[PDB]
């Protein structure tokens, strides 16, 4: 229905990965210890490279990716790096397994919506449009500020026309009388000039097209979970998007580009979810499914207490290419902390970076990285421009980590 489509992204998810520019590999596919925002995790980064190469070589027939590692081992980051290495403005949809558990929306219906967020359209266009109110009198149309040798349609002279050089397309306000009321088919005279050249460049996903056409002005609807039902995007609407998208591809105007669907907490998905993904991997049009698990052994959801590897069923595990993600060294953590500081704008003493690293050692990277923002407030409130070890020591006491938080609440001889 609409050509000028506005793209929407859940930026809060890709907020902590502002520094990851790519995998940081060389020409021969070997990861440089510190490159493109990455610090360490060389083997896993290399394995992600082999994956982006296989996709480009078209050998990932009906195969997936399983990122097995502990919390804060750069899984979501490697997933983002895969989309970046695949090409420019490639769709990246990071979701968790717990997200699929929706009260009003069916488990696979949410999975379907995120698949549409991971399939995009690259529209490279240079529209040479000639519009305005109209072999003798070959060309002659007028705009609101202008007038300007040279198919034949059911339109007479004095009507507003719109015709593009690459593809041919189809009464004006000037002759409309007040005596004629609502029998009206009168359009106003086009603004600007007759000869228009537009650099049309769009990188929108199927979901961006669905959400735009669901709107009959919309920013509030985007900034809202307005109604409990949320019955706007329908099967008929999705089909209409698919038919008009197929037309754009058949015209060679747009490129259907499959992205990366990243599913963290993969063990949360059930048999019904995994069978939806099996059917997805079969499609050539489908994006790459990158799964993540911090679980060694987990029960198969939708199975009679059958415990398996990472909580992924055997049938689906077969398809997956398991990549292990290692924990970091206190030195490795310090680098990541420093990179995060410079991206966030904050700056701290080597001693403050040392204490943040100490928290990144016991508790994950994720917790200690959260310690920068309150300490920046603590330093600035005092009158400092640089964060000190005292502010990290204050922030660790003010804001606790899930494990430490629970242990003191139980304590009001803890083991296992």
């Amino acid at each position: 229905q609409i050509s000028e489509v506005r793209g929407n992204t859940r930026d809060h998810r890709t907020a902590a990965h502002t520094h990851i520019k790519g995998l940081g590999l060389n020409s021969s596919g070997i990861a440089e210890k510190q490159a493109a925002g990455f610090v360490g995790q060389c083997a896993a980064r290399e394995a992600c490279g082999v994956v982006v190469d296989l996709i480009k070589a078209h050998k990932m027939a009906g195969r997936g990716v399983l990122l097995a590692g502990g919390p804060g081992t750069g899984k979501t980051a490697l997933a983002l790096a895969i989309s970046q290495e695949l090409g420019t403005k490639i769709p990246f949809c990071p979701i968790t397994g717990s997200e699929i558990y929706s009260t009003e929306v069916k488990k696979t219906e949410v999975l379907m919506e995120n698949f549409r967020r991971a399939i995009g359209l690259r529209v490279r266009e240079t529209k040479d449009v000639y519009e305005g109110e109209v072999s003798t009198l070959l060309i002659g149309l007028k705009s609101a500020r202008g007038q300007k040798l040279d198919q034949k349609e059911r339109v007479q002279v004095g009507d507003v026309i719109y015709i593009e050089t690459n593809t041919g397309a189809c009464r004006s306000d000037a002759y409309a009388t007040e005596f004629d009321l609502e029998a009206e088919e009168y359009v106003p005279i086009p603004k600007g000039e007759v000869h228009k050249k537009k650099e049309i460049v769009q990188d929108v996903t199927l979901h961006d097209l669905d959400v735009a056409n669901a709107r009959p002005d919309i920013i509030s609807m985007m900034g809202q979970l307005m109604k409990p039902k949320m019955t706007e995007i329908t099967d008929k609407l999705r089909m209409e998007i698919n038919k008009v998208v197929q037309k754009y591809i058949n015209q060679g105007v747009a490129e259907l580009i499959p992205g990366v669907l990243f599913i963290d907490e993969a063990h949360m998905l059930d048999i019904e979810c995994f069978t939806y993904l099996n059917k997805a991997l079969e499609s050539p049009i489908a994006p790459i499914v990158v799964l993540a698990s911090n679980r060694g052994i987990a029960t198969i959801r939708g199975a009679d207490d059958l415990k398996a590897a990472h909580g992924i069923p055997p049938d689906f595990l077969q398809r997956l290419l398991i990549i292990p993600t290692h924990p970091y060294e206190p030195d490795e953590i310090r680098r990541i902390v420093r990179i995060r500081a410079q991206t966030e704008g904050v700056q701290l003493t080597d001693a403050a970076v040392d204490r943040v690293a100490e928290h990144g050692v016991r508790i994950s990277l994720r917790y200690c990285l959260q310690l920068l923002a309150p300490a920046s407030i603590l330093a600035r409130v005092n009158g400092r421009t640089q964060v000190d070890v005292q502010d990290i020591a204050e922030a660790e006491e003010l804001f606790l980590d899930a494990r430490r938080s629970a242990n003191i609440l139980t304590s009001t001889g803890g083991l296992h």
Partner: protein
């Protein structure tokens, strides 16, 4: 594009890995299997057991009896089923299915089981169709958003170029179409048939003289007939939220016309093979459907496989061998596969490398066999693909041990990946040795 015959759809989601299997690899008189023939290698007892089973069906010594293939993971259960399927003919329908696929939010278990069986029962009619026969000159493959190609086919008198869709390219690659082959394409169905080759290659019909109408046999499954007469499943149907369910009114219409053609003599029903992987995954309700369906005369050969010794009968609180209803175990014919010897494993991986067009150094296959021993054939077969690209990156003539070492170091098997995640979060044995 008008219809899609049974041949081109044969074991759709499992054909690639089992492409080398051209049959059961047995002698026709004495049913004794040859150590390595028709793609199959070293699973002698299972292959002979399967051969005895197929003859029992032909002879009519068994009726309403399913086949069960029990063995460890990566021991040729899916392979012997494909070998049984191939030995029945190319115009016999063959449906592959993971028992899990029945449990989906998109369609009901009954619908999923219906489609499964309908896909494995073919309808044979002799009808006129335009057949395009000729010599392959050039095949081009360039992978809207997906594969698009060109086929330059010739006859001694005509030279033409044809653009190909995703479905055709797949069928061409399934039949392994090469420049020089003599092939016939059914224009109504899309059926690619290798007749010969104009010029010999890698150790014999002449280029055809004269697109021609002929009275040809068309074997099309009940599910495809359902699909053709149903609403066209559009582009991006998987991500449109539209269920692949067939409307009852359409099924009724097809079932009546098929019953009419059978009675009239216009058609003959060709029961094929339905293969169900992970049977321990099916419930009490599912097996009952299989019971009812197996009682029919048009019932396909229900072959099923399990990796589990004892499993719970899903839907009940009872346990049994392979998790099968105890009434069902009595009727079924049980065939057992065993692990392969290192020598038996190397032949298989070498065959799979040929089907993947990958050149392994003598030492690269040896490590690929040591890997296959410990972590099974499946993981090892995936390593070939990765090693090919790690060697290609460093611009190698063959895939070396260094590359097989890389794939194994970069990509983990489930046993190592669980061991990884576990030891990284919790230490079982302390620095002193104490647990």
């Amino acid at each position: 594009t008008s219809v899609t015959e049974t041949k081109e759809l044969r074991g759709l989601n499992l054909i690639a890995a089992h492409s080398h299997i051209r049959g059961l690899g047995v002698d026709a008189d004495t049913l004794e299997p040859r150590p390595s023939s028709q793609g199959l290698v070293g699973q002698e007892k299972a292959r002979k057991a399967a051969a005895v089973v197929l003859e029992m069906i032909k002879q009519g010594k068994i009726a309403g009896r399913a086949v069960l293939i029990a063995g460890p993971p990566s021991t040729g259960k899916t392979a012997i089923a494909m070998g049984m399927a191939q030995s029945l003919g190319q115009d016999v329908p063959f449906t592959t299915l993971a028992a899990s696929e029945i449990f989906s939010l998109e369609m009901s278990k009954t619908e999923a089981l219906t489609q499964a069986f309908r896909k494995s029962i073919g309808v044979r009619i002799k009808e006129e169709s335009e057949i395009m026969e000729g010599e392959v000159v050039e095949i081009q493959i360039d992978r809207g958003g997906a594969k698009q190609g060109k086929l330059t086919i010739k006859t001694t008198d005509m030279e033409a170029i044809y653009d190909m869709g995703s479905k055709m390219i797949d069928a061409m690659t399934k039949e392994r179409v090469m420049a020089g082959d003599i092939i016939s394409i059914d224009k109504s169905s899309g059926k690619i048939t290798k007749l010969g080759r104009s010029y010999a290659r890698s150790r014999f019909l002449q280029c055809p003289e004269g697109q021609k109408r002929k009275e040809v046999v068309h074997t099309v499954s009940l599910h495809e007939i359902d699909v053709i007469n149903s609403r066209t499943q559009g582009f991006l149907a998987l991500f449109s939220g539209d269920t692949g369910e067939i409307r009852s009114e359409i099924r009724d219409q097809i079932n009546t016309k098929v019953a009419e053609w059978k009675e009239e003599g216009k058609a003959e029903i060709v029961p094929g093979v339905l293969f169900i992987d992970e049977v321990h995954m099916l419930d009490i309700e599912c097996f009952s459907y299989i019971n009812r369906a197996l009682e029919s005369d048009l019932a396909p050969i229900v072959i099923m496989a399990s990796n589990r010794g004892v499993s719970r009968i899903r839907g009940t609180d009872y346990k049994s061998p392979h998790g099968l209803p105890l009434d069902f175990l009595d009727r079924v014919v049980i065939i057992n596969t065993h692990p392969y010897t290192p020598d038996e494993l190397r032949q298989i991986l070498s065959i799979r490398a040929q089907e993947e067009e990958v050149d392994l150094t003598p030492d690269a296959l040896a490590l690929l066999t040591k890997i296959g021993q410990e972590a099974g054939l499946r993981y090892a077969s995936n390593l070939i693909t990765t090693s090919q690209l790690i060697a290609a990156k460093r611009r190698a003539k063959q895939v070396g041990v260094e590359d097989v070492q890389r794939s194994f170091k970069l990509f983990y098997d489930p046993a190592r990946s669980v061991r990884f995640v576990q030891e990284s979060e919790k230490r079982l044995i302390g620095n002193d040795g104490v647990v």
